[PDB]
């Protein structure tokens, strides 16, 4: 297990992976900040609009 953890950290320690995890957490936080109660009518309207768009043959 020590070797497994060592491999995991040595591969992950690249700035790209740390940035990826940080931005995933930030995306979760922002999606939490975004209010979705008002977004349900927007989703319904988007559904109707996509239906109308694909209706055009």
């Amino acid at each position: 297990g020590d070797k497994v953890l060592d491999i995991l950290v040595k591969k992950a320690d690249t700035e790209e992976t740390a940035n990826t995890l940080k931005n995933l957490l930030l995306l979760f936080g922002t999606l939490g900040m975004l209010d979705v109660k008002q977004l349900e009518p927007l989703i319904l309207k988007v559904n109707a609009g996509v239906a109308s768009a694909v209706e055009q043959k």
């Binding site: 070797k3 497994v4 491999i7 995991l8 040595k10 591969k11």
Partner: peptide, 16 residues
């Protein structure tokens, strides 16, 4: 190849 290479290194530790 980096991520699956790390997974293969874990599998090497598995074999160990």
């Amino acid at each position: 190849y980096g991520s699956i290479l790390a997974i293969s290194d874990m599998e090497s530790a598995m074999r160990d």
